[PDB]
Amino acid sequence: PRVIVVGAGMSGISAAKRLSEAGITDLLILEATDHIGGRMHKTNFAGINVELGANWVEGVNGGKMNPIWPIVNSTLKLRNFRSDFDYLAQNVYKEDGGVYDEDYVQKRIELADSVEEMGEKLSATLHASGRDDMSILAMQRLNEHQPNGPATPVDMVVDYYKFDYEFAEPPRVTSLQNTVPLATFSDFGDDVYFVADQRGYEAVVYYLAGQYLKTDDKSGKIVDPRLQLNKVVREIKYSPGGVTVKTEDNSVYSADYVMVSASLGVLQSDLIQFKPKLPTWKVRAIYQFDMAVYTKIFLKFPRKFWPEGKGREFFLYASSRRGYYGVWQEFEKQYPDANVLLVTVTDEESRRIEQQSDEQTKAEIMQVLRKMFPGKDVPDATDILVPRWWSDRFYKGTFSNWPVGVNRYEYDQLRAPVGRVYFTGEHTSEHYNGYVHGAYLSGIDSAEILINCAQKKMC
C-alpha cells in the first residue's frame, strides 16, 4: 500500500522506517520545514551549536535499556555528560542577593522529596479507571495536611524544579496517577545525559532515516524522493477507500493511508483541515490533553561572573513570583570557555515571553542576574536566543503533558485511527509521552497498528 506520512520528526521517520521494514516502501514523507528532526533541533549561538529543543536522553542506567541511548552513546557516540543534581541545596539564590543556607535548603528538598514519595505510594493504589485520580497539588495538600502546596519562594522554586522543569506545567494541573511515578525513569533508570555534540541530538533522526532512505554517497545528504521537505499539509480528505492530502503549495497527493505525526498542538490548532471532520470522540480527546511549552533562553556574556566548579552546573533563583526565570544552567563542561548561561521558563511565562521582544526579555533577565550577583559587575549579555515554539505553527508547543481529568482510556483515544487516518508522535506514546524515546517508540507502535490492519486485515 501507499502511505503518506505527515511530518519528518522522530516519530514520522521512525514509523516510515518500521513500515519499510514490513515491506511497505511506497511511502511519501511530507515535511513542512526545510529539514527533518522536528523538535530535536540545533542552532548556532555564540559560535556554537546549542539545542533549541530536546537536549537530554532521559532514563539511563536502569532495568531496561532506553532505545535511544545505545544509538547516542555507542552507534554515533555523540558527546554527552550525566547531569548531577545533587548539589542544588548549595545553589538556591535569594530574590535579593546571595544564596540561602545550604542546610535549610536541603531540608526543604527532603520534605518535598518525601511528599512526592508518599504520592507514589498513593498513586499505586488508585483505580485504573481514573475515578480517584487527583492533581499532584491535591496529593501535596493531603500529604502535608495544608490548604495549599509549596508557597514560600524557596519552597516554590524547589517545587518548580521538581515538577514544572520536567512537565512544563504546574503540579495543580498535572495528573498524579499518570505522572507519579513516571515510567521513563521507573523503566529505564534515574540518570539523564545531556547531549553536547556539534552534530546535534538530531543526528539520531538522520541516522535512522539513512537506514532506509537514499543518501548521496559524497554528501551523505538524503536524496530519496520519498522525502519531500517544505511540504505543508493543509488538508486531509479520507473515505473508506483511500485518502488525498493537499499541501500549502498546491500539490495534491493520493494514498491508501495517511499517518499523521504533527504535534498535539498542531492538531489542536486547525492548521490541517480534515474532511470529513474528525468524529467528536476524537476531537474531545484531542482538546482535553495538554500541549506544554518549555522555553530555553540562551545568553552569552563578555565575561563570566557566576560560580564554576563542583555542583555549580545547575542553580535556582527563588523569586516571590512563581516560575519567574527560576532554573539556570552553566556549561563549564559542555561548552568550555563560551560564557553562556541557559535559563528555562515554561507555561504562562513562556507565552508571555514569546510575545515580547528579545531585548525586553534580555532586560528582564539582566535585572534578575544583577539581583543574584550583587557583588559582581555583571555585564549585559551580548547575545540572547529565545526559541518560540508555541508561536511556530508547525509545533504550537514543545511536548504534551497529562492533565488531571484525562484517564487512560481517553488518552488512548488520542492514538486511535479514524478510518484510514492513523496518528503517531510523542502524545500517542503509551507510557512515554513527552520524550524523544516516546516519539521513537510511538512511530513503531503506530506503524505496527497500520501494518496489521493493512496487511493482515486485523484492525
Place this chain on the structure above:
Amino acid sequence: PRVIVVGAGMSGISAAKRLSEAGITDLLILEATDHIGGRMHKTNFAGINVELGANWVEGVNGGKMNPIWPIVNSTLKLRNFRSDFDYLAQNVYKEDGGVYDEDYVQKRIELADSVEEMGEKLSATLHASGRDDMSILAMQRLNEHQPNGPATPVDMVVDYYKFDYEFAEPPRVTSLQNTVPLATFSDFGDDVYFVADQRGYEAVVYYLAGQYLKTDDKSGKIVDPRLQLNKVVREIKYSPGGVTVKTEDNSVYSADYVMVSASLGVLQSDLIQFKPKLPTWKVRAIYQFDMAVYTKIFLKFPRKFWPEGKGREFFLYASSRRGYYGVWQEFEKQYPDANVLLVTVTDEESRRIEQQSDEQTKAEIMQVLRKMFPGKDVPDATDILVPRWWSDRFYKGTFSNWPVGVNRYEYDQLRAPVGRVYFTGEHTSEHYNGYVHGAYLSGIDSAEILINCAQKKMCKYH
C-alpha cells in the same frame, strides 16, 4: 438532645436557628473569635466601614428568590446597589496607558461569552457521576480550536474577569460541570447587588441569630449564654454514645451531637483534632476540594484621578502578566467623595501578597496606576488595606472552589456526617458552594439531617 455548633458564621447561626425551630433548644454555639458573622465581616478603612469578606448578594431577580435577598433588601434595608457590568468594553486599560478601543474589546468579550455558552451545552450532557468532567480551560480550547485558552493581554483580563473574579482560581483548575452554568445565577437570577451599609452585610447574621438568641433590651447585643464567643474548639471526641468538645482555654463540654461549620480551609489545616481520627475516605474528600483566596485590596487617595460616570464603576488593567492587579472598582455611589479604589487579586497573587508588606504591595500598585493614567498626576495612596484571609487560622482562605478531579460522590463524602459529628458550611452546599446563600441553606440542610437522626431516628445518611 444537646447539640454543640462549632462556629457562628452564617451556616452555624443558620443551623442553630433551624434546630431551635425543630425544638432542639439545648444548644451551645462555640465561636472562635470575639464576634459572629465569620466571612461576612466589615472593618474601618480610612473612616468608612468596608467589607473585608462577602460584599454582594449574588443571584437576584430570577425565577426563584435568593433567601438572602429579602432580609437585606426588605427586612433590614441594608443600603445596596445593583452592579452594572455592561460597560466594561469602554474601560479596559492598556499595560502602558490609555484604554483600548471599545469595539475591539467588545468583540473579544463577545467571543469569550460565546465559548462559555457553548460550554454550558456540553456541560448539561456530561455524565452525572462527574467522571467525564474537564476543566473550563479544556472546554475553551475545544471551542476556540487553539492549544491554549485566552493568551493576549486583553483576552486574558477578560477571561480573568469572567472566571477568576468569581471563582478565585483559574479556569484550568476549575470544574466545567460544576460551574458552567452556575446554579446561583440559573436559579436566582443574573443580577448581583453590592451591600454598602455601615452596619455591614453581617447584619444579616445578627438578624437571624436574634430570632432565637436572647438579646439585651437597650443595646440589642446578644446575651444568651447559649452563644459563647472567644471559644476556639481544638478537639472533638465522638463515640456511639455522644461527643465531647474541648476548647483552647481548656473548657470541656458534652453533647449528643456536634455540628462543625468551620471552613474547608480550617478542616484542611488540622486546627481541630478529631478523636478518633476521621476516616480516610473523609480525609481524602477534604483535601481534594479547593479552598480559594480572594483578596480585596482597598486604597485611599488624597484626590481622585480616575474617571467617574456612567459605566465607570468597574475597569480592567490588561497586564501582560495574567491576573496582575487586573480588576478595579471605583465607589462613586457607595462611598461618594471618599477617594477610595478597590483592586481585587486571587490565588497565586493573593498568596504572594499576603506574604509581603502592605508598603511593598502599595508601591507595586502605584506603578500600575501611573501606567494606566499617565496624563494625570497620580498621588501615592495614603492608606491601604490588604485582608489576610489565607493567613488567618480561623479561615485559611476565602471560599471553596470545585476543582476538576472531584466527582459527585467525592463531594458527597465531603458533606457526610461521621457518627455523631455533622458538617455544615458553604463547602457543603450541594449547588451553591462559595456563597452567602449557600452557607445559609447548608446550615438548614445539615440541621435537618441531624433532626431526622435525633427526632425521627432515621440515622443512616445516603
Place this chain on the structure above:
Amino acid sequence: PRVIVVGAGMSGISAAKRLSEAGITDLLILEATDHIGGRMHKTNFAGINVELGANWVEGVNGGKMNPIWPIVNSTLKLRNFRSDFDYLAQNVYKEDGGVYDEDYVQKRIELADSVEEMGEKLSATLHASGRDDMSILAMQRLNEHQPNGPATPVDMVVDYYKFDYEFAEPPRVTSLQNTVPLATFSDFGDDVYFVADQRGYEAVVYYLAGQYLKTDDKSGKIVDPRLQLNKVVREIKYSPGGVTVKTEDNSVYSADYVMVSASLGVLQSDLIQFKPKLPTWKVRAIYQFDMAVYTKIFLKFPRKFWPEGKGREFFLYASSRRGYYGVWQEFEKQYPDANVLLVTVTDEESRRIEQQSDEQTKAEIMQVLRKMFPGKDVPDATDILVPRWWSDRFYKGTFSNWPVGVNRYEYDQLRAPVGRVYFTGEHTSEHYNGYVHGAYLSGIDSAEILINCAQKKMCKYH
C-alpha cells in the same frame, strides 16, 4: 427530588411505582393520551373488547416466574388461554385453496426447527463483543447449505410464523446472537397465554398504578393529581442542575430529573425536542436499533365459514408473496359467538396497509379468504379494525427488534442516561426487549439507577 415521568405505559407506571417505594413521591407523570396503559390497550369491536396491542403473557411455566404471570393469573384472574401451535401442519392453506397434506407440512416444520436448533448452538459460541454476529437468514443458509433461506410458499409461511410473527421483521434483518435462543422463553418458559378478558390486559397496569396513586373510593378511578393526562411533552431542556419540560398545551414544568418512557419509535421521530440536542453517541444508538410494527387486523362476519375444532385456532395462508395476510387466528375459544377472525401483518405490509383505507384493506382480505376457502360462499366482512400504531405519533411502531449490526454495548447505550435525563421502556430492557414483562422490569431497573444517583449520590458509570 422531583421527577417528571414522561408516559404512563407499563414502564412509566412501573418506574413511578418503584420511585414511590424509595420514598421519592414528588412525581409528576405526564401522559400524552387520555388514558394510561400505552401499548396495552383494548377496544370495543363487534360488541367485544379485543386487544389492539399486547395480547399474550409470553414465557410461562419455565424455570423462573414471569413477573406479569401472577398478576394476570392470580391477583386479577384475567380470563386466559394457553396457545397451542402443535396443529399447524394440518392448517396451512395453499394459495388457491385447500390445506396442504399434513405429512408434507410437518416435514417442512421439522426441518425449519432443526435449522433453528443448530442456530442456537452456533449462537452460544459467538464472541460477546458481537463481532461475529450474523442475521438469522445467514445462519439459515449456512445450515441448509443453500443460497437463500425459505423460498417456496409453504416454507416461507412457516418461516414467517416462526420469526416475523414474533419479532415483526424478517430473519434477514434480525440479529441471530441476540434473538436465538430468546431469553424470555429460555428464562420464563416456552408457553404463551392469550388474555381474553373484558377488563383488558391493561388491567395489569391499572392495578400497579392503584398501588401508589390515589383513586376515587367509589369510581375506583385514579384521581391523584400527580398523574396528568392529555399532556403531550414536546420539549425537554436540561442542565447540570435540573430539567424543564414543556407540553404542547403550553404548560411548563420544572424538576430535578426526567424519566423518558416514550417508545423508541417516538424517540426516533422528532416529537420531543431535547435541548441541548442529545449527544452523538446517544443519537446513533437510537437510530441503529429497530422499532418494528405488528398490525392486528380484526374482521367481523355475518356467519362463520372456516373450520372450528381441535387444532383449528391458528392457520396459515401460504401466499407466493411472502408475508401477505399469512397468519390467522379464529376465536372459537375466546369469543365463542363472535364470528371474528384476526389476521396479523407486520413490517412492509403494516406500513402499506396503515396508509390505505379500511375498505381497500377489507377488499384485499376478502380476495384472500375467497381463495383459501374456494368451497365456501364467503361472506363479506361487515366490520374491520385496522390498528395504526406506526402512524400514531405517540407510538410510531409496536415494539423494538434487535437488528444485525448492533452489539450489547450499543444496545446498552440506549438505556444510558444523558445528564439528568433518564430513559426507560421495553427498548431499554436488558434481556426482554419487545415484551410487556420487559416494559415492567425496565421501569424498575431505570428507577433504581435514578434512585442510586439521586439518593445515594452514586451515579453508576457503566
